[PDB]
Symmetry: D2
Subunit: 392 residues, 4 copies
């Protein structure tokens, strides 16, 4: 097996099959033709019996898919228009009325909204459990439990699950494990190598790395991915990825290892700095020894990531003032960009709501989330330092 960086650059492509083109040509074409009629029917007989033919599919998307499957260590990939496209296409395929899905206690907002206000209104039953508590997960299992779905680390506090421990429970009961591996990327964590069946990504974030595309990825077995392609994507969401954007995503993936190394190195320094500041009450970073799941983080993730969450002593007011004071960090809801980003859900995504409603799965008044970018660490430190002064 070539190394990760080699595979991120080369896997699945030989220039000699495309006239020597070092960079694969971009198939910006909505349709492909047939040499004869019966040739065209072999293709569409193939699908609907369950099988996926790679001509009649887009070679640009097929390469992205193959490369992502390689990096995750999985059999098959699927490229979609957004992370939400990946999540919905997957879950719409795998669940029907009467099935139960077991969920991590805290999810990305639109994932939560899709589950509770979307598929959960179509007869699918939902239950949240703490995926770190393997006792409680085992106790929540029923024979109708079809899917276990979580993020690790999860928003907001970077709470982790023991993926291999969850997978053991799933295997005993007969459930499918879907992990949103957006935060880590395959460079830091490979849930399929720990027993998960499927991984989903918002490739909009670190995989792209540059904030210029929206994309999703699914990786898993050929059997599952084919179903998600043929039903979830083709019939239930139509979340088709542009070949232009797939090509830009592959461009980003060529520097994934280098970018993640810098995101993590910057984040570790910033996290250690924040831990020593008088304005800061609590910090959630996997790379600090104080992190409650430090041991599990070191076992499951090869580096502690680019994401930091922390709480300011002065609560929502201090959070607002801190956020407003940032000059180099931008105020924005995304993550995994070259540019450093910050958000303070209490005064941003959840503002008109009351303090008591920010509670059950839970948003601290003072919780700030940082996506630590690729800028010079001294410039980022200076920005954070002044914004902490301004937070009082």
């Amino acid at each position: 097996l070539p190394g990760f960086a080699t595979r991120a650059i080369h896997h699945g492509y030989d220039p000699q099959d495309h006239g020597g083109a070092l960079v694969p040509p971009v198939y910006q074409t909505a349709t492909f033709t047939f040499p004869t009629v019966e040739y065209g029917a072999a293709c569409f007989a193939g699908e609907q019996a369950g099988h996926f033919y790679s001509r009649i599919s887009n070679p640009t998307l097929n390469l992205l898919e193959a490369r992502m499957a390689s990096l995750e260590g999985g059999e098959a990939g699927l490229a979609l228009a957004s992370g939400m496209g990946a999540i919905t296409s997957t879950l719409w395929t795998l669940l029907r009325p009467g099935d139960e899905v077991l969920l991590g206690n805290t999810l990305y907002g639109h994932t939560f909204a899709f589950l509770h206000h979307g598929i959960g209104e179509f007869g699918v039953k939902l239950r949240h459990v703490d995926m770190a508590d393997l006792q409680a997960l085992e106790a929540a299992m029923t024979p109708a439990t079809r899917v276990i779905y979580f993020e690790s680390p999860a928003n907001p506090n970077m709470h982790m699950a023991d993926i291999a421990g969850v997978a053991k429970i799933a295997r005993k009961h007969g459930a499918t494990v879907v992990v949103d591996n957006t935060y880590c990327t395959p460079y830091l964590q490979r849930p399929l190598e720990l027993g998960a069946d499927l991984v989903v990504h918002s490739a909009t974030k670190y995989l792209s790395g540059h904030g210029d595309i929206t994309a999703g990825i699914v990786v898993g077995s050929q059997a599952l991915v084919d179903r998600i392609r043929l039903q979830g994507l083709k019939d239930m969401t139509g979340a088709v990825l542009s070949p232009h954007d797939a090509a830009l995503l592959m461009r980003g993936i060529k520097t994934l290892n280098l970018r993640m190394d810098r995101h993590c190195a910057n984040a570790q320094v910033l996290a250690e700095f924040l831990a020593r500041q008088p304005q800061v009450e609590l910090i959630h970073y996997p790379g600090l020894a104080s992190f409650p799941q430090y041991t599990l983080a070191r076992q499951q993730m090869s580096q502690p990531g680019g994401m930091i969450a922390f709480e300011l002593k002065g609560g929502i007011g201090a959070g607002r003032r801190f956020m407003n004071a940032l000059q180099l960090f931008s105020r924005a809801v995304s993550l995994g960009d070259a540019e450093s980003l910050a958000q303070h859900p209490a005064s941003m995504t959840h503002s008109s709501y009351t303090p008591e409603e920010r509670a059950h799965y839970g948003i601290s008044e003072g919780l700030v989330r940082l996506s630590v970018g690729l800028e010079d660490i001294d410039d980022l430190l200076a920005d954070v330092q002044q914004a902490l002064k301004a937070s009082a």
Copy 2:
């Protein structure tokens, strides 16, 4: 006030507001930042109230949406990753278990599959009705009837619905009317002017015109479109359109009137040619006086369209031969491209599941569909001519 071609080129954009740029810049950015968290908060708060906030949405997408709303004569537009993304985002928003949807008798294949194998398996009730039979439609209405959905013209015979008659019925019973207007485009037919509530498009086809993007559009009232944006798109499909592709779609729309004029002119010559030929049993072209719904077609459509369907004497084998002899027309499933396309579903989309399972009857068997392109009509005539000879 301004004419269709003027609006397709200019609507919603003045260069003087973007530093004089004659062509609007392409916003290929996954996210937008906020000057304050309070500003950011106000955006997410009103989104949670059900209000869509233009700007802090993507200006490239917003311009495409405004321009399509203008061309269809609707209040609001929505851009999505594919036609299927348009259709699914709409139907997932409008329907819940217990609701019924009345459908046109024949549907595009993935639409059919979505309804019967997708949303229909989540407790939504389906019934097909002839949307030209207002008495059958009235009789099929129930208190659960929430949506009426069809294409006009519809495959394979270009069967027309009586859109104004359907809408009257829908308004009486409180149902929402959704029309897939892909075939005509707003240049030939505007279902919202006939009482439809929503129109959907595979912008992949004629709106693009050049077969290089995949895209969908919804146009209708602000109230309906806002729900579809905020629930169907954001939560249930994630079918997000690339700004690169949105810009190309706008580029295509600038010649829509010209292209549709030529598609219709060419198709009429080919249909009148086909009418005079001994190998042709039957032709479905709205512009021939013998088309069964010629008068209704003319009330709803300003020109008879770019699509022809015809049946060969000799059935499946004659079709197979016709298709394999074509040298200028390509064998492919799409439509609305500059390139002329043909398909014979009996031996392409539907060969392997063979003549017994084609128990639609009047639909299949010997039927060839032409998407008449923009090439020189004498070249297209010669190609059809020689393929007809080869069909014997």
Copy 3:
């Protein structure tokens, strides 16, 4: 031979050669690799001996070139980063110190500047001649004359050259005739069929049609185009066209016939209208019966074009007021866009060519809207 519209969509490409892709894939790659060193020796043991293989060249650019060569009825095509790229690559290849280039009396501004302040400052001799006056052109030929270069029609009055007449004169001296065919496009005029050796285009204008790319095209005989590729482009300008923009250009070309028909139809209406307005002193539109070169125009052009120039009676102030009143037409210097454009050089390009000269690039908008805009601007010009 397939018809123009068929060739603009199909020429040079079969989907069956590229895995069925209806639209050809975009080769957005700077480099191409070799299967063995033996093979990669062939590709540079060949350009060194003046031979262009289609192997280390880009397939997207090659297809665009092939299609443009087909539309102009020439042997070979070359794609470049701009019309100025086409013009300079061509003239740098064909001229050396002491050579003479005979020029149409009026040229696009940057072409004029290139000639007078660029190549003309490196010892190349320039002379301007009326390319409709065949006796004057003949009397201007010298042994140094190596190239005859002009636009037809030319700014500001749409002055026409007699292309076949020029070619006949050139042939007696072996001189190379280069025609800038930007205004007409191959759909309206094909100078190579009238005896020119090379045509150049700012593909930025009508060929693209949509105002979103900058690009140039050269079409001509194989020997000349090869030298322009291997010397002018490769070594003297580096005016390399992006494969992305080449793909967009090909996209524009698929509707060239339909767009030109509408540009011409709209300009015909606006010219009939303007020609009888009180405020209008003179009008230059090839489709008007009273255009001085009506007959020659109709011999060379299948339609009279999308461009109109006219002169307002009230001079520079009238021109200014007209321009500032326009609400649908945009104030800009380009042409050949879907959007209608207007310029008044006396108050725009030339702060200090008539005082009242206005040029319209008539676009694809509804003619009733363009007429209303021009009408109210005319009233405001009083």
Copy 4:
């Protein structure tokens, strides 16, 4: 405090752009427009009258290209930037602007092949006099200076041998005599070497190479004084080459520049490991890598370049049969004549670019552009290919 220059990586990502001026867009929108319109006729006379007199007021300039230019200027420490369709576009637009018949240009002893061809068979055939001088020999340079010497032009390190020049030393001679110094900084990028900060007047790049980093665009950059860059814009580019860069490609070049520091660090780290490994292999006769003390200009390389680059040249024992066999055995390195890509590339000039000629550049010479792949995979490829050349 606030008068501290932000770090190189911060500037490569942010310089020149605030999202709040473009409706919050985190990534700047792409101005894929050939033309810009005017609010009145007068606003437009002021722009066109200004460009004639010598000015680059933005002048209704393309904001995508302007941002790229300002960012490249910041990184090189220059006043102004200009973006063009290729490296040759940058080189030709620059030299066509600065030279006229009777002027002399002094040239480094080796040049990129198309640059050599432009000079000898292009501008040199229009009355511009050429002379080649070793730009590392400051005595020889001083002695070659004449009253007609208008431009001194060279690459450092030079294609293909990596010969270096003392840029500050050259600049000092040019100051005394009056010549304009133009340095092709392609190989190093501003991350490794900033010739303007050493006294050069202009720098040019094939941004096609490292600045892009991903082998998908062709592009050139010039950086220097506002006066010289404006002149080159308004004459060389606008009138003499038309080498216009696509806004689409300019945006991709900015995307590449956001990772320039990280990529250059990995190119150099990999090349150092590969150069140290190659130096110890039986079949390697000589190796030229700036980071090895065997490099003939080791101390000049250390002085001018913050890291020793991504390029290696070495000679195999066993001649052309060796090099030919080494090349054809490569399974991860590609056979290609380019550099600064994510993909590692190799060439053997004897069996490739100079194959048409006879031995009468050594016969076992190989040039490597070391990419971003895992070093263990690159070592294994080179090691198995050395076995096959044996």
